[PDB]
Amino acid sequence: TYLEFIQQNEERDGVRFSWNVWPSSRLEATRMVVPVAALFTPLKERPDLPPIQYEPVLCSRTTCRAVLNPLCQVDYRAKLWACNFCYQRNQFPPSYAGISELNQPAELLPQFSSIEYVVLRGPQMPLIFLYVVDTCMEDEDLQALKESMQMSLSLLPPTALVGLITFGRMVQVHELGCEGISKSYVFRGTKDLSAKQLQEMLGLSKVSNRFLQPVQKIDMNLTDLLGELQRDPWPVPQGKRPLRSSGVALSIAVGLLECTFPNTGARIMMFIGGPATQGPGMVVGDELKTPIRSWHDIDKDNAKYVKKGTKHFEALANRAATTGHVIDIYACALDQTGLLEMKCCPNLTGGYMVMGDSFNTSLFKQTFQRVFTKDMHGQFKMGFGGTLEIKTSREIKISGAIGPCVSLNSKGPCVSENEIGTGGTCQWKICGLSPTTTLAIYFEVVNQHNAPIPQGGRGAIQFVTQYQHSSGQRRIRVTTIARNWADAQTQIQNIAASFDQEAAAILMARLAIYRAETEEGPDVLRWLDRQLIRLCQKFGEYHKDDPSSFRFSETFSLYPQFMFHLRRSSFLQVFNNSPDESSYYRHHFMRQDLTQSLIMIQPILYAYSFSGPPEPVLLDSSSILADRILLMDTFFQILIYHGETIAQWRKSGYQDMPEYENFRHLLQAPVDDAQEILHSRFPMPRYIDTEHGGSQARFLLSKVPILTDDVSLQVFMDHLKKLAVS
Amino acid sequence: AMGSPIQVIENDRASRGGQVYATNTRGQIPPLVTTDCMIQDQGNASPRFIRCTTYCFPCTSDMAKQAQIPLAAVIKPFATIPSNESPLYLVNHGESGPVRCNRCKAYMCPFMQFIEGGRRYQCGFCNCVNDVPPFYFQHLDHIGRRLDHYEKPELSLGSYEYVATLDYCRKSKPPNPPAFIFMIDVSYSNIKNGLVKLICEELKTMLEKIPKEEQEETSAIRVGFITYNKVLHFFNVKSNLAQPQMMVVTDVGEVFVPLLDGFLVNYQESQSVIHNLLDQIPDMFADSNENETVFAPVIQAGMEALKAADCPGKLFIFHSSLPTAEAPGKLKNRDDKKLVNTDKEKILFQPQTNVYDSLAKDCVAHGCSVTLFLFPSQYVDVASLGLVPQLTGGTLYKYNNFQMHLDRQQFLNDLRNDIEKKIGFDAIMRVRTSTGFRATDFFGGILMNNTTDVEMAAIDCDKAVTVEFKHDDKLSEDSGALIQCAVLYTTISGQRRLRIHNLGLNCSSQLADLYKSCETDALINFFAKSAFKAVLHQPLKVIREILVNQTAHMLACYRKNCASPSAASQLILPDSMKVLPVYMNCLLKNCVLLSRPEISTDERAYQRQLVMTMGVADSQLFFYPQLLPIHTLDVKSTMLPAAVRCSESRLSEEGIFLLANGLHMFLWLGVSSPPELIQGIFNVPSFAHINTDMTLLPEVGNPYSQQLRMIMGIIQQKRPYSMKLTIVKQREQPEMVFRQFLVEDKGGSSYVDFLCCVHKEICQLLN
Amino acid sequence: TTIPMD
Ligand SMILES: [Zn+2]
Ligand SMILES: [Zn+2]
C-alpha cells in the first residue's frame, strides 16, 4: 500500500514528497503540474535511534563530499566504498577495519537511512538567553511577564548565560552580578547603534561578560531584579501612546551578542506590550488619534511607517541570522504590536512568534513555558545554528527552499539555475530549529535531452543537518532517500500512483503563500487555479466536453477539496484579519509539518451525538445539526458548538440532574478532547465555547478571469469539472 | 618722597576707624575699605555694597573727557554685613508689587519727591510725575517728609528688599527651590591622589550644613550625584531604595539625563541611601584605570537635569585634568608662544572650541550656575575650563599639584565655605541712573545678551560686579547723579525677591571737586577689570599703553587745572590719588599683563578670572600684599602687627615675615633668624632644621606659635579663598616666587621707576 | 603730595 509507504518514509526520514516515483525526463515532469518537491523535517522525533558517537565519513571528491550511506556499494575485502552520488571510490578509515558483509557500520544499514552523528568539535559552548523586555504596559501585564520570565530562568541549564535588557522611552542594558549597587547602561531609544559602537560604548573587547552570565551564578540577583522591575516611569499624556523604542532595543540586543558571542547558539527573546512608537523600527504614531495601519491602509499606500519600519527589522534579521542567533517575539497587547514589520526576525532566524491579548493570560503563560519543553533526558528540545546541505543525484537539481531559513549562497552542481523561494544554494542556515521545524525543498529534473538513459535505477537525495544540540553537544543529522525513476511514456501509471495529494497540496500552498508576499497580487488565486485545472486534465478520468464524466482516482480525489479550502483561507485572503494576524498565521504555516499544515488549510470538524462515537464530519453547514455537538479544530483555535436542541437541554439544566448521567457526559466528551489539544499543541490555540444563536457562532459559520469566487465546494467542483474536460 | 601705602591706610584708620559712618549726606566720601568703622544706613547705600571711583561726577562729557577719570562703581549686591550692623528689611507692596516710576521703572526709593499733598510723586531719575497708587497714599507734612518716611524702609534707607510678584517670575509661576549637583571626576588621577574618597567621605559631613532659611526647618535645596571619565554615571537615590542604582550614559556628544525622581532628592529623606553611595563610589572606581575624561558633557548633563526638574541649580564639579576624550569640548594641548607682541596673544586666554560659550548661555538661560574645583597637575587650559563657571557666576578653585598631606585642609576649607555661602539664584541685575549718564559697561562673573541686563545664574556675598558709566546728556550740580542697583533673583527657599541699592552722588562743573572725591582703590579695581577684559581683545602692550597714558593724562589734567603753581621739577598728585601710581604699577607688573618668562598660561588665565569677580576689599589686597613682621611681635597681647612696605628693603636677616595677597600666604624666614622663634613655631631647634616641602600647620608653641596662628586667622577672616601657606627660607630657596609679591621692587619697573615714567609723559603733555 | 624728581 502506497499509504503505508508514505507513512513509513515520513516516520523514518521525516520526509514527504509530492511524488514518490519521478519522471526520468524534464519535459514530462514539467507537464506533471506539481513539481518534485518534499516537505522536510530535519530533527523529526526518533527515540528508536541511538546517537552513535563518531565522525560521519565523507566522499573524497571535493565537489561531492556526501555522507557514507546505505546506497553506497561496499567492497569489504578491499576496504572500499563507492559514493552513490558521484561514484568516486573511497577508502574507509582505519577504525573501520573489522567492517564485513555481516558486521557492517550502522550508517550502511537501511534501518539507519537517517542517523545522528556526534561531532567532536571542541568549543562546548553554553546556551545564551537574552531577555529584551518592554516596560510600557499595565502593572498586571508586566507583573505576569515578570513571573513567566522567572519560570523560564529556572528551567535554564546552570551553564547557560543569561542577559537582561529592559526598555521603554530609553533602552537599558543591565550589568548583572554587579552586587551592592546594581547598574545599567542607558541609551536614547531614539537612535540606532552598530554592534561596534555598542562594543566600544559598553566597553567590551573584540570577539562570560558583565552582561551575559551563568544561570547558576546570577539566579539570585537576576530573579531579584526581575522581581523589582517596574513599568517605564515617564508618564503618558492623554490621547497619547507610550514612547516604546522596540526597534532600538532589538538593535542594541542583536549588537550586544554580535560583539560578544557571535556564531553560537543563543535566543534573543523580546517581549512587547504594544507597537514601537519611537523609530528606527517605529511602527506608528504616538497620538492615539491615528489607528495602527490596516491591510486596507497599507494597500491605499496610507501606511507611512510600514516600509521604513520593516526595512529596519529586516536588516536586524539578516545580521542575527548571519551571526547565528535566534530572535523570538512575544507580542501581547489589546491591539497590533507591529508583527508585520518585525516578522522577518523570527521568520528568517528560526525564532518564535507569539501573539496574545495580555501576558496575564493562561493563553500566553502556557505557550511560553511550552517553549522550554524538555526531552526524555531533561534537555530542551532546541537546536541551534543548524546548517542544512542537500546533495542530489546528477539527474536532479535544487530549485530552492521555503521555510524558516536563510541562504548560505553555496553554489554547486546540485543548484539549479531556475530557482524557487530561497534558492541559488545547496546550503541554508537555520539558527533556531526544533523537532517540528519543517522546510519545503523544491527539486527540478535534469536529463533535459528528453529520451536519455533511464538507467541507473533510482535517483537519490541526501540531507545533512549540523547543529548545536541544547546539550552543548555538536551534531550532524544525516538522511538519504531514494525513489524510483520511471519512463512516463510507459509508466504514467506507476508515476500517478505515487502522488501524495496531502503533501502536494501543502507544498503548493507554500509556493502560493511565498508568492503572496512577493511582488505578486491576487494573480495567486489565478495561478493556483490554473494549476488545479491542469492537474485534473492530466490525471483525471473523463471524456472531452462531458463534465458529468469527470472523476478522480482516490489518489487525487482530495486535492481539489484542499485547494478549495486554501484559496478561501486567511492565508491568501488577508482582508479580514489585521496585518499582524496575517503575519502570525503565515509564520506558523510555513513552519509546520504536513499533518498540522493540513489542519491549518482545512479545519477538522468532529461531531458528537448520543447516536454513536465522535466521527469527523464534512466542513459543511450540513454537518451542523440540532442534536449534535461540534468540535472544530483549526490549528489556531479549538471551537465547540452546541446545536439548538442540545443548547436548550443545557440552558435548561438537565446536566446536573442525576437522571441525565449521559447527557452530562455528552456535554463533557468534546470538552475533554479539547483539553488534550490545549496542552499538546504548541502555540496554544484560542478556545471558544458557543452554541446555536450564540454571539460567537460566527467563528464556526464563517469557517464553514478567476476559477471562481466565494462560493460552495460543490459549485466550485462544478465550474472545475467543466473546465477540466474542455 | 611719596605718601606710601601703609601710611595712607594707617592715617585713614586713625581719623576714621572706630567711628560711625552715617550715609545721610549725598556725594559723601566713604572711608577706605582698609578701614574698620561701623556703618549705619540712613539714606544712601552702605559702602560695603557699593563704592565708586569718584563720589562726585563731572557735569559734562567734555569735563569728564579732560580729566579722563573713569566714572564707575564696584557693586557687591549681597556683601556680608557685620553682625553689629543693621540687616536689610523686606518690603512687600502686595498684589501689585513694588511701586515703580512708569517711565524709567526705578523702584520706590528715598529718591522720589512726593508732591501735591502726597498724591503724585515725581521720580528722581527721569523727573516723570507718577500717581501714588491708592493703597500707598500718605499725607506729606512740613516739607514733604510724608509722615511715613522713618517708618517705611524703602522711603528712608539706601538698601533693602522688595517681595517680587508673579510677573517677576519665569512663566509667571512661583519658582522652585534650587538644587545642588555634585559631579566627581573619578578617573585614575583622582582615584590615586585619594581625592575621590576624600570628596565622598567628607561630603557625608558637609551635606548637613546645606543652607536653609530660618523660617523653614529643613533645606528646600535638593541634591544630586554624578561620577565620570569620558562617560557619565548618574545615580538614583530616591527615598525608598535600600540600595542606590547606577545608570551609565556613554553617548557623550548627545548627552541626556537618564532620570527624574531618584536624582535630586532631599538629603534628609534619602540620607542613608546617599551615604551608602558615598561609601561606595571610592571602592567602585578604585581599580578604574581610565585617564582621559570629558567635560562639556558634564556641565551639559547637570544643566539638563536642572532644566528637567524645572528648577535653578549650582553644579559642584570636581575635575582633575585636561579633558581629552573625544566629545564636544574636547581640549587639546594648544599652549603656544604667541605673546609679548603677538597681537594674537589674546587667543591663549579664550576657550579652544566654540562650545563653551554656548553651553554657558544655555546654563544661564536655565538658571544653572557652575562652580569648579580643579586639581590640575599639568597644563589644563584654564582659559577654557573656567569660562562656563565664570560666565555662569560660579567660582573657580585651582589646587596645583595636589598632595593630600598638605592641601587636604585648604580644599576642604574651600568646599565647606562654598556650600554654606549665602547665595541667590537665576538673577538679573539692572543698574538704572538719573538723567544725564547711564551704565554702559560691565565687568564681573556675568553674562549679557542685551546692553542693560546683567545675568547671573548664581550670585553670592563675595561676588562684585563693576559698572562703568558714561555721559548721556548734562548733569545738574543741583541734583547730582543718582544710582539704583536692583537684583532680581530666586532664594534658596524658592522665593522671587528684589534687592535694591540706592546711592546719591554729587555733581559738579569744577574739576577740583571731581578729584577731591576720588577713591584710588575703586579706580584700581576698575582699571584692573577693564584691562583684564581687554586681554581677550587687544595686544597686551596696547593695554599697558592705555593704562599708563590714562594715568599720566589724569595727573596732567589735575596739574594744569587744579594744582597751585609749583616748580616744574616737581610731580603733583591729588590726595585722592596719593597711592594711585604705586598700585597702578602693581597692575602693570602683574602676570596677567606681563609675559612668558615663567608663570604658566594656566596661572595667568586663573588670576585674570579671580580678579574679574573681586570687590574693592579684595582687589586692594591682591595687588598690594600685606607684609607683617613676626619676629618683632608683641607676645600674647597682640592685635595684628603693623604692616610694612612691599619691598625687600624692609626684610631683615634676623626677622620672620608674613606676606599675604588673599590667595597665597608666605612665611618668610631670614638666615640669622632667631633660634628661639624657629623653636616655638616649627618645634625644631634651628633654621637649617626646617623643610620647606613641609608647609603644614605647626601647633604646640605656647607664646608665639599661638600668637602667629592668631594673626594667620584674623588675616584669612574676611577672605573668600582659603590661602595656601608657603614657607620660604631666605638665601636661594623657593624665595624666587616670594620676591614677586614685593610689588614695590623691580622684580617690570620699581615703584620709583614708574613714578619717574609718569612724570615724563606728564611733562610731554607740556603744561 | 608733591614729589621732586631728582
Ligand atoms: Zn561522492
Ligand atoms: Zn523715573
Coordinates of C-alpha atoms and ligand atoms in Angstrom, one line a residue, chain B residues 101 103-106 123 125-128, ligand 2:
Chain B
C101 CA 8.1 105.0 38.1
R103 CA 8.9 105.8 32.6
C104 CA 12.3 104.6 33.7
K105 CA 10.9 101.9 36.0
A106 CA 13.0 102.8 39.0
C123 CA 10.6 110.5 40.1
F125 CA 15.7 109.6 38.0
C126 CA 13.9 111.0 34.9
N127 CA 11.7 113.7 36.5
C128 CA 8.4 112.0 35.4
Ligands
ZN2 ZN 11.5 107.8 36.6

